[PDB]
Structure 1
Amino acid sequence: KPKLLNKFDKTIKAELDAAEKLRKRGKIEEAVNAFKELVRKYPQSPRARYGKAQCEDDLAEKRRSNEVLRGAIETYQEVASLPDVPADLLKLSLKRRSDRQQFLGHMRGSLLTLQRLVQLFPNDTSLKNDLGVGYLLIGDNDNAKKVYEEVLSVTPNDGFAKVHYGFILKAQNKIAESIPYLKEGIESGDPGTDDGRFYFHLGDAMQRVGNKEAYKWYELGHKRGHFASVWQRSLYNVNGLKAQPWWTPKETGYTELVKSLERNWKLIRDEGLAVMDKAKGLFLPEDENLREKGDWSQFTLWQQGRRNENACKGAPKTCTLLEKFPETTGCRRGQIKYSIMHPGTHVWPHTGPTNCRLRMHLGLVIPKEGCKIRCANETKTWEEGKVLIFDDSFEHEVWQDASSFRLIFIVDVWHPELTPQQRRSLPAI
């Protein structure tokens, strides 16, 4: 199918095949000089330069170096600047250039390439789809929307365009309108639609409009390998870790941490309330995307295993207490923080980013009624001086319908089945 040879190229198929085969063999440094010399021999050889680029491209993957890759990105460009270039080759060259530009984070550079391709091939639908992604990657949702509307006006059933259009609509706070576009695009089974991100947004949208069918799509996502289960849907995971929504302190093995929290809870409470009264500005609003309504703030002591020195000066005894338990102060994928929630608050269902942590909640100030938290299929309430433990990689949801504020202390710990070496090796989240 691919037509990569023009008349001038058709006279050197033997030389090219050899040079090409060397790359295929894995002996790359030969293919470089091999193709490099094919330029000096015949400078107007797109396929020769295209080879050199692929060599540099493959050589980049080999050496894990961005510098040589930057070279390839230019060589792919050179291919497109030659007098007579076969269309198929021109498309392959600039597409790979755009892809590698995106890889390095040259998003606007990639966009310019994509804009060039669309100008060269004004009838290729897939290229317009790629142009749309280009706009999305620089945060230009308005131009991306126009692209996919253009596509859909010509190809109404293009699935790739539907899921992206749906995503754009959702981002513009047109939640209900986004759902059918996301549904139809996924059901089309078109290339690029079987992506966990679209299951994520589809399920999220449905839940925010009160459609209980969301879990059917989460389950399907699980079947497609996008989610660990219908409930457990975190992105950054380690395999083999025991997965259950609620834990008892004994099951975690962190019994001494739990005892220390429950026994000195009044102390932890009082330093939190003091910050409220004297430095309320230290309580920052929580995730706006997760808050449907109400007032919900947080005061952080540890973040990604990093102590906040200024914050500990406001709660010196609590920090001193926590220093003794590295399973939480060293948890690079968790936090330690006060969390205050006022009446009329609702937190949308959601999961945390990883399955490598458990989340402890110590009740500090709990109204008599109105406050509750669901994880998976079980709903519970807090108790002053008592610790709850759940795996927040499982879907959880929170309500505050009391007559006074709710204060809790949040303590993340390494998943207990993680080995010391794993706890040392994992990147931070």
Structure 2
Amino acid sequence: KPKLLNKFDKTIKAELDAAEKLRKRGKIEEAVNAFKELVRKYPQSPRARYGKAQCEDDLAEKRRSNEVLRGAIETYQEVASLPDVPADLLKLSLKRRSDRQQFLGHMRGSLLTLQRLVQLFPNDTSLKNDLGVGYLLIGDNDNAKKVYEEVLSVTPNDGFAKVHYGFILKAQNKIAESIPYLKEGIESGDPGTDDGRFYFHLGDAMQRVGNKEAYKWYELGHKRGHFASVWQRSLYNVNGLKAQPWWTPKETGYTELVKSLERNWKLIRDEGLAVMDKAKGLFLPEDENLREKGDWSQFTLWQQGRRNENACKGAPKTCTLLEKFPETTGCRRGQIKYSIMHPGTHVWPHTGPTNCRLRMHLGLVIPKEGCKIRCANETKTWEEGKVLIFDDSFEHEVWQDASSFRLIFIVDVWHPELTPQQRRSLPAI
């Protein structure tokens, strides 16, 4: 069905088919030099140029080389600029370019290629759907939203556009509105709709509005492999890690860290309070849409295993203290931060992104009553100078119905069963 040869390339179909046969049979070195010869003999051949690119692409996979792949990405573009490029070949070449650009993390370059693709094929629905993803991958939910509105103005039942539109709506806190789009799109079954994100957010959406069928969808997500359990709904996981909502210090093995936190708790408190008191902008409001109501702000010392040097100027002894514990300072899937919460605050039930961390909470200023945290089926409270430990990949929920402010210190650690290699290699979150 693919029509990849223009009239010129048909005049040399035998040479092109010989080169491609070498590639399909795995003789990459041989194929590279065959298509190189063809590109040399026929500088204007689109098919010879595409074969060169596919061979560079294959050679990048064999060597696991980003640099080689960057070369393939440029050759795929050369294909699109040659004379009389068949439409099927033009689409294949630029689509692969954008896909490989995404693989490298060149999200801005992929977006440019995707904008050119949609401009070349205005009627290809799937290219617009992929353009929307391109916007989402750069954090441009406004342009992404327009793309999917366009799409389902033309094609109202495209399941892919439905779940992506509902995902965008929920991100904008259009909870009730996003439900039908997320719900219908999963039941569609279209390619790209069987994604844990959409199961995660549909259930959460339904939970926030009281729609008691949310857990029916979580169990479904569990059946599809997206959630380890109905309660533990993180999506960036290492399978087999001990899963329990509450931990003791002994169970984590990080007993010296827990001791250092509790023994030095007044020093940690006083530095955090001193930062509050200066009243600069260092405590930032929570900005993940997790609050039903109230006031919640956080002052972060470490994130993604990276020390915030300016923050540590405001809590210099606390930061010096923590350097002794790479299990937290090097936890590239966690943070170290102070968290202040004021009266009249309720945090929605929610889950963290990964099962590769545990969270330690050290009480610093805890009103005698009104402050609660539930994780899974158990509700606990903080105490000044004491550490609580839970797995925030389990659903958890917080209340602040006290008469004054509540301050804690949050120290993330690698899940103890993660190996040193896993701790060095896992992508940061």
1:336 alignment partner, SS class: strand
> With structure 1 as the length reference, what TM-score do the two structures score?
0.87
Cα distance in 2 for residues equivalent to 1:353 and 1:362: 22
Cα distance in 2 for residues equivalent to 1:195 and 1:327: 31
Change (3 A) 1:194 1:271: same
Change (3 A) 1:49 1:168: same
Maintained 8 Å contact 2:196/2:235: no
1:92 positional shift = 1.4
Q: Give the 4+ runs in structure 1 shifted more than 6 A.
A: none
Change (3 A) 1:322 1:180: same
1:110 alignment partner, SS class: helix
RMSD: 3.0
1:330 positional shift = 4.4
Change (3 A) 1:394 1:121: same
Q: Structure 2 regions of 5+ residues with no counterpart?
A: none
Cα distance in 2 for residues equivalent to 1:82 and 1:391: 56
Maintained 8 Å contact 2:307/2:329: yes
Change (3 A) 1:319 1:186: same
Of all paired residues, the percent bearing the same amino acid is 100
Cα distance in 2 for residues equivalent to 1:142 and 1:329: 35
Tell which deviates more after alignment, 396-405 or 274-283: 274-283
- The aligned length equals 429
1:342 positional shift = 0.6
Tell which deviates more after alignment, 279-288 or 159-168: 279-288
1:406 positional shift = 1.2
Tell which deviates more after alignment, 343-352 or 176-185: 343-352
1:412 alignment partner, SS class: strand
Cα distance in 1 for residues equivalent to 2:24 and 2:307: 51
> With structure 2 as the length reference, what TM-score do the two structures score?
0.87
Change (3 A) 1:428 1:116: closer
1:106 positional shift = 4.7
Change (3 A) 1:390 1:60: same
2:51 alignment partner, SS class: helix
Change (3 A) 1:354 1:14: same
Tell which deviates more after alignment, 145-154 or 391-400: 145-154
1:369 alignment partner, SS class: coil
Structure 1 residues 25-82: Cα deviation after superposition (integer angstroms, max 9, x where no partner): 3222221220122233344432222211111222233344444434333433333344
Change (3 A) 1:264 1:38: closer
Change (3 A) 1:112 1:329: closer
Tell which deviates more after alignment, 403-412 or 167-176: 167-176
Cα distance in 2 for residues equivalent to 1:112 and 1:319: 42
Tell which deviates more after alignment, 298-307 or 392-401: 298-307
Change (3 A) 1:48 1:345: same
Cα distance in 1 for residues equivalent to 2:227 and 2:96: 30
Cα distance in 1 for residues equivalent to 2:112 and 2:82: 19
Structure 1 residues 275-306: Cα deviation after superposition (integer angstroms, max 9, x where no partner): 43356654333335223322222334444455
Tell which deviates more after alignment, 311-320 or 242-251: 311-320
Maintained 8 Å contact 2:173/2:289: no
1:84 positional shift = 3.6
Change (3 A) 1:317 1:350: same
Change (3 A) 1:427 1:88: closer
Tell which deviates more after alignment, 172-181 or 252-261: 252-261
Change (3 A) 1:86 1:400: same
Change (3 A) 1:314 1:117: closer
Which residue of structure 2 lines up, in the alignment, with residue 222 of structure 1? 222
1:238 positional shift = 2.6
Cα distance in 2 for residues equivalent to 1:138 and 1:319: 32
Change (3 A) 1:256 1:95: closer
Structure 1 residues 124-167: Cα deviation after superposition (integer angstroms, max 9, x where no partner): 32223223334444555444444333332332211111112222
1:212 alignment partner, SS class: coil
1:246 positional shift = 0.6
Cα distance in 2 for residues equivalent to 1:74 and 1:307: 37
Which residue of structure 2 lines up, in the alignment, with residue 101 of structure 1? 101
1:14 positional shift = 3.2
2:281 alignment partner, SS class: helix
1:257 positional shift = 3.7
Change (3 A) 1:147 1:386: closer
Tell which deviates more after alignment, 164-173 or 180-189: 164-173
Cα distance in 1 for residues equivalent to 2:119 and 2:127: 10
Change (3 A) 1:428 1:6: closer
